[PDB]
Design a protein around this ligand. Structure first.
Ligand SMILES: [Mg+2]
Ligand SMILES: [Zn+2]
Ligand SMILES: [Zn+2]
Length: 1245
DNA sequence: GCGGCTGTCACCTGCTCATCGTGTTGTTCCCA
DNA sequence: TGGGAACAACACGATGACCTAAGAGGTGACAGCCGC
């Protein structure tokens, strides 16, 4: 399986595939339900329908093996051959392939220069076309032929003059004789009108026919190949008159003749000449056609494969028909399409045999063409061929593309064996690496192992008896299942897998019930809440599979998220509300025994049980040898002449009992903790534990924290009641006064001083003031010991706006058509919304529900594109010896001359290693290529630096893809990135996870358009696709003097640069809110009007580092405006993929074509080669691609076909005859092979 | 020869069932 | 096995002559065809 190539399928190739010809449009006999002969589903050409049988029955006996029968012609062998055996049908009239012609423009042929309409006319027998002209013989006989045409013109004139003499005689005779008769007053004038009618008729008819001959003559004079005679009468005239010099045809026969005669070398030569010297559109068209011409020229596959004379038939078992109950049949649409084409082919053969007129044979040939077109693609041209209902039929190419196609429904994602699912319930008694799975589910998944163990343990004498008893559900079966499930890791999974911590391996323990028991704090990795959610489950089988499961995927190991490195499996909700109650202060908690001193914590809990001490009362507790005091409290160590071993001596601390209990959950070596560990400090402590202590102890500490959090959450006293929702007394008076102001504004509106818009905006301002005032008063009112206050301030569940709506005020809401209701909801949910208030409030609820429903699929599509782009960027190198990096701001924000760590070092500079040693005082503060953790940050910010040079993938220069050292440390594992890490998929998943929760879009229209650039996920797709921003704003090309040349017809802003440069201008709208004044000094890389700068501009005028910085900053802008945190590396992966190609110009020397976005790598190597030969090298404009385009440009065509545009991709791959090498991730899961990543690398293989 | 605009190709998404136009031939049944 | 009758095949070609309803996507990317 070294490679897989596709080209054109000749007639000979199709004949070589086949074993027989399908001649009848018949599938099976409706009565006897058997294959017919030489039809669809036939048994002579395809394989036997029954294993080891033949049609007639002479060799129905199974003994025979591989022989051919002597009566029916069916060989005796297996019945699966019908899946593999193929046939063909010989067409009478050749037809064109609807892919290679009448398709996407770049693949529309262009080998024969013809417009789409001209080919539409030729192919579907509506216009003729010349396949050959004897120009040399035509010119040789042109003296003779023009003399002959002059002779015919003179004969026409001679008989015309004889008829003119006869007309004069007739006129004289009729005039004279009628005048002599005088039967009427105007006999002479009446017959003068008659004779003038005859004379005019002959004049006009003679002119018509001599002009007809002139048209035929000059048409023959100017007659070349690829010339269409739309009118058949004129073609008949030409064939009758000057035949034997030119040859014409209709339909695909003409195209076949041209593709056979036409040679490509000379065409490529002229195309190279014109592209070398071309202007405007003509050059672009020339190079576009040259692409296809060179594709056919370089390769051995001939263009004649683009016209078809034989059609292959897919094996019958891939298009089966089956008896449905009620005497019915369910059959594949392919059978109907094959029947249509065979019907029309046979009717055409009949018509040819009878020598039918041209019209009938032409109609039948056109119909056969349309039939094969529907067979290959039903929807490209005309109306589709519907099947049973009005719905369209399924074409052979419709079975490859689309969401439900073969690639995207059967080769990437498969239904699997040894799998189960069920609802998910919380087991709070589980260890981090444990899952409780129902009894029946465990029995079903582990069946074969259970039978093997039952037989081995002598509970059964044979495997079938073991199966019988397992089905019967005996007790010994259940004991054996308990024995066997041990040491078999089990992969739990949730439906939407937004990242790698969405499938996790657990150790299975056998449990009763009908639901799966899961750990309480792995609910954020899965996003699984217990509201009816379901969990799927899989069982690895091979030793390697389960070894990887336990080592890599085990839930105990997966504690840190890959998106930012913060721990994800940490306590939350009630657990944190319990540890917060444990370590909170004594405020409003009526302490007892405050100020007392205890000789141990055991004595403290004695006092607590006695009821004379509180868990949260300030008391002086002594801690024994081993306890490590707080880091902050150490410098206030006990005063004594002797040197006290603060690290390892008994000490005393004015702590609280709850904190002394909390610090027993953490490991003994951990320093004491003496502050409210609500939610954020717990995250910090868990991060420190993960980054400092080994994983087993971190899991044990997490378990202890879980147990303590639940235990103390039960006793916290947090219980929601209608009194615990405290409506502030402030709300009444505030809402009444602002209501009075609203009344005044309404009165001044109804009096006519203001407009309705002014009244609105005034009331929105008034009620925003009222809402915020009530919010702050509500925050002030409740104590900090309140239930809701406790769960919010502890960071368990809740925000302050939610509390505002519940307790104080709901406020203004999104009116219909995304507006702001002037009058707000002046009532919280506790007080009770009115009727109209509720009706108004449901608007935003509905809108948000619909928005979420759509945004799920939107983010899914975005993640699909990101994965397809970034896939195969795999760490293959331990260390490239580069010394380049990014100059990232290490400690900026010198507001009042104070060096402060930047506000986003966690996402940007953290985890990125160091290019080289940093020295500010003549000594190495940070050694080279060392993990850049917080300690180095404190050192460098203290010593005053404002930048740092970090290794990165963007600046990585390695022979084999990316290297571990430049990427940094894996944000998921903490340690250095391991070689073989599928970093691209990790980056794509990291950017895709928060996509659903962005929720950034305009709340109200606000009477603004264009200025409001797209917000949220639309913005992210806009940046990642390289699409020009909606609110585009030009960016100055060079430093210069900029002024306004506004014209009433069209406003303009014109900048002329200094340094003797050419002027530039930008057309701008009237509503521009210009951020640059007139006649001012702009610089090389500055904006002009308010908007969104194009990434293309920033790549063009500034450079490549500038576009990288701009894109990363612009995506992080929205991401960190939400609060989502993604490391900059995950964006940098996509940015690196987007800038890997260059558009080439001045390319005749470098031996390639201008354009074609040659790869940067390719451009460089071939310029090196041409310079080595001696010729100068070509030049390159850096190009910023999109994600769809950058993915579709893959060297491997399997991946491109799998992603999108299967028809176009496969057609181009066939034209180019380009093979696919196995290297890649996607294209190695299509073939079903070990991926070139993780432990599948040849090093580990 | 070079623009607009104007379509056309990509993507994103999901159990009932109505007749002719005549007349004849040969097999294959159904009854007895 | 006789007649009595059901389907699958066939061969011809009854003085008169035309659909049908269904049917609101949206957004990019682009290359033609038509206009200057
Ligand atoms: Mg749920
Ligand atoms: Zn046989
Ligand atoms: Zn590197």
């Amino acid at each position: 399986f070294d490679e897989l190539r596709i080209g054109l399928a000749t007639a000979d190739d199709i004949r070589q595939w086949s074993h027989g010809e399908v001649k009848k449009p018949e599938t099976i006999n409706y009565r006897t339900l058997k294959p017919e002969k030489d039809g669809l589903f036939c048994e002579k050409i395809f394989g036997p329908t029954r294993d080891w049988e033949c049609y007639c029955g002479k060799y129905k006996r199974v003994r025979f093996k591989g022989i051919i029968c002597e009566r029916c012609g069916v060989e005796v062998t297996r019945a699966k051959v019908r899946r593999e055996r193929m046939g063909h049908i010989e067409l009478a009239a050749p037809v064109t392939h609807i892919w290679y012609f009448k398709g996407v423009p770049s693949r529309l042929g262009y080998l024969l220069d013809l417009a789409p309409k001209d080919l539409e006319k030729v192919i579907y027998f509506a216009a003729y076309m010349i396949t050959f002209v004897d120009e040399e013989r035509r010119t040789r006989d042109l003296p003779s032929l023009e003399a002959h045409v002059s002779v015919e013109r003179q004969q026409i004139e001679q008989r015309r003059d004889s008829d003119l003499e006869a007309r004069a005689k007739k006129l004289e005779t009729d005039l004279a004789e009628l005048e002599a008769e005088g039967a009427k007053a105007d006999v002479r004038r009446k017959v003068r009108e008659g004779a003038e009618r005859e004379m005019k008729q002959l004049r006009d008819r003679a002119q018509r026919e001599i002009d007809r001959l002139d048209e035929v003559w000059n048409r023959f004079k100017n007659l070349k190949v690829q010339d269409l005679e739309g009118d058949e009468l004129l073609y008949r005239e030409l064939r009758d008159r000057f035949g034997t010099y030119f040859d014409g045809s209709m339909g695909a026969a003409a195209l076949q003749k041209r593709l056979e005669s036409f040679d490509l070398d000379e065409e490529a030569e002229r195309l190279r000449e014109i592209i070398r010297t071309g202007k405007g559109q003509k050059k672009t068209r020339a190079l576009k056609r040259l692409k296809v011409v060179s594709a056919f020229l370089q390769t051995s596959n001939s263009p004649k494969g683009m016209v078809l004379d034989c059609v292959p038939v897919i094996p019958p078992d891939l298009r089966p028909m089956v008896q449905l109950d009620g005497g019915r049949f369910a059959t594949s649409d392919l059978n109907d399409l094959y029947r249509r084409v065979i019907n029309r082919n046979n009717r055409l053969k009949r018509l040819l045999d009878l020598g039918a007129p041209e019209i009938i044979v032409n109609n039948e040939k056109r119909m056969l063409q349309e039939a094969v077109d529907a067979l290959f693609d039903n929807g490209r041209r005309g109306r589709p061929v519907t099947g049973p209902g009005n719905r369209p039929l399924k074409s052979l190419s419709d079975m490859l593309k689309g969401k439900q196609g073969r690639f995207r429904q059967n080769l990437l994602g498969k239904r699997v064996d040894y799998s189960a699912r069920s609802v998910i319930v919380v087991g709070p008694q589980l260890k981090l690496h444990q899952c409780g799975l129902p009894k029946a589910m465990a029995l079903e998944l582990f069946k074969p192992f259970v039978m093997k163990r039952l037989v081995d343990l002598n509970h059964a004498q044979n495997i079938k008896s073991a199966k019988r008893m397992v089905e019967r559900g005996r007790t010994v079966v259940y004991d054996v299942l308990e024995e066997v499930i041990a040491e078999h890791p089990v992969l739990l999974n949730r439906a939407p897998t937004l990242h790698r911590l969405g499938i996790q391996a657990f150790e299975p323990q056998l449990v009763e019930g009908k639901a799966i028991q899961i750990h309480p704090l792995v609910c954020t990795a899965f996003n699984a809440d217990f509201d009816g959610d379901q969990m799927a489950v899989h069982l690895p089988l091979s030793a390697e599979a389960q070894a990887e499961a336990r080592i890599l995927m085990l839930s105990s190991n997966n504690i840190l998220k890959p998106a930012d490195g913060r721990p994800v499996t940490m306590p939350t909700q009630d657990m944190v509300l319990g540890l917060f109650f444990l370590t909170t202060d004594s405020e409003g908690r009526s302490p007892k025994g405050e100020g007392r001193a205890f000789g141990s914590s055991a004595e403290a809990i004695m006092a607590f049980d006695a009821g004379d001490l509180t868990l949260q009362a300030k008391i002086d507790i002594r801690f024994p040898v081993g306890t490590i005091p707080p880091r902050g409290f150490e410098p206030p160590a006990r005063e004594e002449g002797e040197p006290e071993w603060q690290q390892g001596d008994t000490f005393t601390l004015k702590t609280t009992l709850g904190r002394a209990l909390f610090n027993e959950l953490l490991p003994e070596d951990y320093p004491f903790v003496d502050y409210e560990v609500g939610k954020k400090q717990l995250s910090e402590i868990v991060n420190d534990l993960a980054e400092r202590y080994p994983k087993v102890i971190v899991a044990a500490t997490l378990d202890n924290l879980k147990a303590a959090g639940f235990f103390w959450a039960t006793r916290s006293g947090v219980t929601v009641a209608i009194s615990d929702i405290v409506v502030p007394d402030a709300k009444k008076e505030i809402v009444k006064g602002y209501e009075g102001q609203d009344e005044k504004v309404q009165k001044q509106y109804e009096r006519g001083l203001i407009t309705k818009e002014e009244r609105t905006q005034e009331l929105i301002a008034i009620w925003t003031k009222a809402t915020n005032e009530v919010a702050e008063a509500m925050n002030d009112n409740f104590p900090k010991t309140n239930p809701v206050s406790m769960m919010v301030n502890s960071g368990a569940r809740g925000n302050m706006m939610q509390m505002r709506q519940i307790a104080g005020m709901r406020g203004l809401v999104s009116n219909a058509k995304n507006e702001t209701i002037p009058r707000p909801i002046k009532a919280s949910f506790r007080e009770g919304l009115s009727v109209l208030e509720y009706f108004i409030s449901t608007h935003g609820a509905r809108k948000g529900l619909a928005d979420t429903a759509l945004r799920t699929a939107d983010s899914g599509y975005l993640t699909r594109r990101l994965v397809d782009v970034s896939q195969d960027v795999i760490i293959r190198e331990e260390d490239c010896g580069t010394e380049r990096g990014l100059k990232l701001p290490i400690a900026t924000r010198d507001a009042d001359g104070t060096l402060r760590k930047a506000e986003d070092v966690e996402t940007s500079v953290y985890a990125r290693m160091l290019a080289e040693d940093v020295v500010i005082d003549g000594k190495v503060i940070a050694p080279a290529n060392v993990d850049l953790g917080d300690v180095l940050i404190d050192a460098l910010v203290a010593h005053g630096v404002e930048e740092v040079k970090t290794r990165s993938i963007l600046t990585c220069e390695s022979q084999v893809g990316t290297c571990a050292m430049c990427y940094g440390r894996s944000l998921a594992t903490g340690k250095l990135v391991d070689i073989g890490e599928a970093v691209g998929i990790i980056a794509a998943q990291s950017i895709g996870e928060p996509g659903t929760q962005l929720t950034m879009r305009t709340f109200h229209t606000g009477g603004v358009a264009g200025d409001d650039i797209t917000q949220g996920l639309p913005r992210v797709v806009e940046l990642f696709e390289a699409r020009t921003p909606k609110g585009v704003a030009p960016i100055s090309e060079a430093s210069g003097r900029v002024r306004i040349e506004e014209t009433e017809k069209t406003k303009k802003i014109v900048v002329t640069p200094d340094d003797g440069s050419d002027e530039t201008a930008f057309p701008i709208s009237k509503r521009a809110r210009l951020l640059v004044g007139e006649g001012d000094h702009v610089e090389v890389g500055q904006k002009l009007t308010v908007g969104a700068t194009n990434p293309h501009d920033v790549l063009r005028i500034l450079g490549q580092r500038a576009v990288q910085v701009h894109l990363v900053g612009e995506v992080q802008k929205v991401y960190n405006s939400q609060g989502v945190s993604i490391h900059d590396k995950h964006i940098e992966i996509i940015i690196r993929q987007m800038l890997r190609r260059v558009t080439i110009i001045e390319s005749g020397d470098a031996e390639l074509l201008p354009g074609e976005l040659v790869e940067r790598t390719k451009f460089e190597t071939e310029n090196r080669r041409v310079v080595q030969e001696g010729g100068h090298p070509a030049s390159g404009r850096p190009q910023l691609m999109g994600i769809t385009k950058a993915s579709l440009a893959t060297e491997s065509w399997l991946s491109a076909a799998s992603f999108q545009e299967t028809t176009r991709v496969l057609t181009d791959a066939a034209i180019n005859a380009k093979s696919d090498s196995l290297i890649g991730l996607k294209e190695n899961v299509i073939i079903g092979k070990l991926i070139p990543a993780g432990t599948g690398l040849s090093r580990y293989r």
